[model samples]
Target: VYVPDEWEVAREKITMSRELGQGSFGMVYEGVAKGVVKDEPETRVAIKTVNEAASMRERIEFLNEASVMKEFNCHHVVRLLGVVSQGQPTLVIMELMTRGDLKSYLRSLRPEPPSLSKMIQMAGEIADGMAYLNANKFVHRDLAARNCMVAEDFTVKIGDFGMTRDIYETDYYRKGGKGLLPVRWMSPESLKDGVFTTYSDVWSFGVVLWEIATLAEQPYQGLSNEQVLRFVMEGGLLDKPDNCPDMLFELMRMCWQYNPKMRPSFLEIISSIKEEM
Candidate 1:
C-alpha cells in the first residue's frame, strides 16, 4: 500500500528543532511531531526535507524514500511515520534513532571499545534485517555503516532508503547513472557492468562488517575510487582488521567472492553469524 493522503500531516504538526545531519537528497532535523495522539508524550522524530531549489530528480528521489520505507514494518527497519507535503516545504517524519548513524558512532567508540560479543550481535542484527529485505525482493543498493542507524541500547536499525529499489520480480537491475558509484562497497560485477543484485549488497555488507570490526576505519584506505575498482576486479580483498575474529573474517571473504553468484545470501550470512555469536 502507498502512503495515504491522510498520512500527510500538517506542517505545523512538526516543530523542527535542531539539525540532526545532512543526507545526499536532503537535510535531516531532530524535531518533535505534535498533535498526532491523545495525551501521548511529545513524540520525537527525525524530519527529512528536500532542498527548496532541488531538481526534479532530487525531488523524486526524496519522495521515493517515503514510498520505500512506508512498506517496511520490521523492528530492524527504521519507521517512517508520515509526510508533511501540503502548505510548507515537504518533510518526511521518521522515528528518531538516538545514537545516530553507525559509521560515526563506531568511530566515537574508540575511547571505550565494544566487546566481541557485542560486535557479533551487531553483525547478526544487520544480517537479519538484510535477510528480511532480501526475502521481500528489495535491494538496498547502498548498504553501508553510514547508511544504518544505532539506538540508545546499540540496536542497529537499517535506514537511509533514498537509494533503495524494489527488484520485485527480477534478480538484477541495470545502473543508469554515468558518474562514479560507491566503489569501495560495491562488488566487482556492479562496478564493471552496472548490474546490481542482492549479491552486490552482500558484498557491501562485508565492508560494513569490516567497518564494525575496525571501529569504522575507512575501507581501502589511500585508494582512489578507480583504484578500488581495479583492486577488487583483480580479486584484492580487504586485510583483516586488528582483533577481527577468524570466523567473521572468513564470512567477509565469502562475501568478496569474484563471482556474484558465489556470495552467500543474507539468510546464509545470518545463520553463520548466529552460530558465531
Candidate 2:
C-alpha cells in the first residue's frame, strides 16, 4: 500500500539521520520537519509518507483513514499533525514518539521482573482509547501492539488505521460481513465474517493485554494464524501471559466470546480495570 516514490516532496526535505522503525505504510524517519509552524523547523515530529502510485482503492483507503483521524482527535489516539502534498507524493506529519512502540518497549524490559500493576495500567489506557473510538461509532479494524505507541512517560497512543472502518449498516451501505482479513486479536465472528463491533475491539484488547504481559510476544506463537482462529472458535483459550491477573483474564475471555452481543463494551472493560486500581 505504501510506495517510497509517492512522497518525493517530503522525501527531499527530510534529513534521514536515523530511522525510528518500519511499518506496512512506510518507514518512519526521526528527523526535523524542514518547514512547519511559521517557517520554523519542527524537530519533534515524525514523518509518515506513502506512495501515490498505489491502487485507487488503496489511496481512497488512506484518505478514509485520514478522515477518521481528523474527526476523532482523541488524546488516547495518535494526533495527526497535518498532511503536505503538491502533486503525486503524499506526506503525513505526526507527533514524534520517543519511546517507540509497545512491542519494543516491552522487549527492553524483558529478563527483568515484570510489573503486574503496570500491565493493568497499560490495559486501562488501551481500554480508554478503545472506548473513545466506540463512543464515536468507529471500529479500529487493524488494532494490535504494533499499531500502538508509548511515550517516555508510558502514555499510550493508538495509530495506523489503514484497515479501519466506520460502523454503518444502512440501505446505502450493505452490511458486508464476509471474507475479511484475519487478525489474531479479532473476535471469532469478526474473522468468520466481516461483522465487527465494539466487542471485536474488546477481543483485540485481550490480545493487547497479552502483549503487555509477555513483553510483546506473538500471541500463540507456535500456531499459525489459521490455528489461532480455530482455537478461538473451539472455546480453546490462550494461556494468560505472565503477571495477568485472573480477573483480567476473565474479562479478556468475555471479549473473545463467539457471540458478539455477549461481549462486554470498552466501558465495561474500563470499569473492570478500575476495580484493580
Candidate 3:
C-alpha cells in the first residue's frame, strides 16, 4: 500500500512455486509474474515472501526495498518487478538470479584455467550498472561479489539491498559499539569516518574487481576486521591477482587511490573497458 500504485501486483498475477531459500526477511520462492513487463506474457521472478509473524516495522522495511528498486531499471541491475502487499505473505517480486550470485559462481570455477577477456567483460557489465546508479545519485553501499548476481547467460546484475540497517544481517560483521559493516569490502573513508558516497562505492568496486580477478578469492585474507582497518589506513592495497589483464588491473588500482576524489568514476571505467571489447 505504500509504494506507487503502478507497482502494485494483484495476488493472482503471481504464480508462486517452490521455496528457493530462506533469508532474514522471509522465504524466497521462484515464481512467474504475468505481464510484469508490458506486452510480455510472463517473466520468471524471485518472489520474496515476508514472514506472517514479522513485526509492522519489518513489513515497512521490506516495502521500502521495493521503492528503492523501483527507481532503478538498468538491465545490468536486477529489476524490481512489483510488490504484493494487499494481504498476508507480503511479496517483493524481482527478476530471477538464475545462476545465483557472483561470488558463488566464481568460487565454483576455482583451480581451473580461466578466460581473462570474458571475465573482464563481466566486470564491465557490472560497472555499466553502477554507472546508471551513479548518474541517478544513488550509492550502492553494499557493492561486493556476493551482492552481484550471475544470470543464466552468465551476465552479472546487482542483487540484494541495503535498505534495511539491521546489523545482524548475514552480510555484516559487528564492530564494537560502532555497527555492523562489511569491513573488507568497505573504503577507508567508510571505515574511518563512517561515510559512503560515490567515491566510497568506487573504492568498494575495486575490491569487487579484485574478487573477479581472483575468481572470488576474498580480500584481506588472514586479517581480522581491525587488522584490515589498520592495513588500509597504513596504505596497504591488495596485491594484483595472478593472470589479471594488465589494463583491467590498472583500472582496479585506480579505484583504490588513497584520496577518494582520485578514484575513477564508474562511467569512466565503463567507457575505458568498453573500448577493449
Candidate 4:
C-alpha cells in the first residue's frame, strides 16, 4: 500500500497511523486502539494495511493472514492482538514490537563479532517456534531473519506468514515438487521444483541458523537468486558460518540434505538445540 503520510499510531485513540515497513504486497503500521479491553486495554498495536488496489484474492489473502494468525495463537508465534475492518482495506492489529525485526537487530550487532551463545539461543527460539507451527501441519515458507521479531525482553517471535503455505493445502505435502525454493534458505527438492515437506522447512531453518551465527550475513551473498537456485540444484551447498560450533554445523548440514526424507525432524532439532549433543 502506497502510504503517502508519515504517520505513527498514537498512544491514544487515533484514527490513522504511519507505516512501519512496506513489502511486496502491503504495509505495516503502528497504531493504537483507544478502547480494547478484551486483551490489553489501551493497547498499542502494529496495524497492517493492504491497499484497496490489491486484487480481491490478494485482499482475501490479507484476511487469510489474519485468519491464519488467529489460528496460530501461540507463545512462540507473534500474537495478533486485534482486527480493525475499515471497509475497502482491512487492518490487522498486532502487538507492537519495540526491538524490531531480527535483520536490523543482527545488523546492529555485526562487524563486531559473532556471539556463539546468542546464535545458539536464537536458533533454539526459532526451533521452538518452528516446532509449534510444524505440529499444526504448517510451514513458514519464508523462514528468514527478516520474518523474525525480537521483543524488548530478548524474546523471538516468528512474523510474516505471507509466503507461508500449508503442507496439506493441496496434497503437496510429500510430493516433493521443484523450483519453489527461496534460493538462499531453500531445500534441494524445492530448488529442483516446487516440492516441499516438513524437512524443507528444516533446511531453511539451517540457513536461518547460519545467518544468525554470522550476525545476519546476507545468505548466498555473492550469488543472485537464480545462481543460488542453480547452485542448490547442481549439488552446491552453503558454506559454514565462521566460529559456528561443530554440533550446530553438523545439524545444519543435516538440514541441507538433498533428500528431504533424510533430514531430521524439527522435533529432533528441538531436542538437539536444548541438549547440545
Per-residue alpha-carbon lDDT of model 1 for 171-216, expressed as tens digits?
1123354543667778888778778898999999999989999988
Better model by lDDT: candidate 1 vs candidate 3: 3
Q: Give the TM-score of candidate 4.
A: 0.82
Model 4 global lDDT (CA atoms, 0 to 1) = 0.70
Clashes of 4: 12
**lDDT against the true structure, each candidate:** 0.78, 0.66, 0.82, 0.70
Superposition error at 221 for model 3 (Å): 0.8
Q: What TM-scores do the predictions have?
A: 0.87, 0.78, 0.91, 0.82
Q: What C-alpha lDDT, on a 0 to 100 scale, does residue 269 get in candidate 3? A: 88
Kindly report which residue pairs in candidate 1 clash with one another. none
TM-score of 3: 0.91
Q: What is the lDDT of residue 26 in candidate 3?
A: 80
The alpha-carbon deviation from the true structure for residue 203 of candidate 2, after best TM-score superposition, in angstroms, is 0.5
Model 3, 1-277: lDDT tens per residue?
4644788889998998886666658878888999898888989898988898987788888788568777787999998888887788788889998888787788888856567687778888889888898888988888998879888888899776342423214446677856668888888888888899998989988988888888877688888778988998788899888877788689888999989988989988887788887
Model 4: residues >4 Å from true position, as ranges? 1-16, 34-39, 55-57, 161-181
Tens-digit per-residue lDDT, 1-277, candidate 4: 1221212223335354676676445766676776553655676667777786876677766666566665675677887765544366566667777788786788788666555677777788888888888888887777877778888788898886343233112211222354233567678776676676778889888887777777777677788666777788888888887778887788889888887878888888988778752
RMSD in order of candidates: 5.6, 7.4, 2.8, 7.5
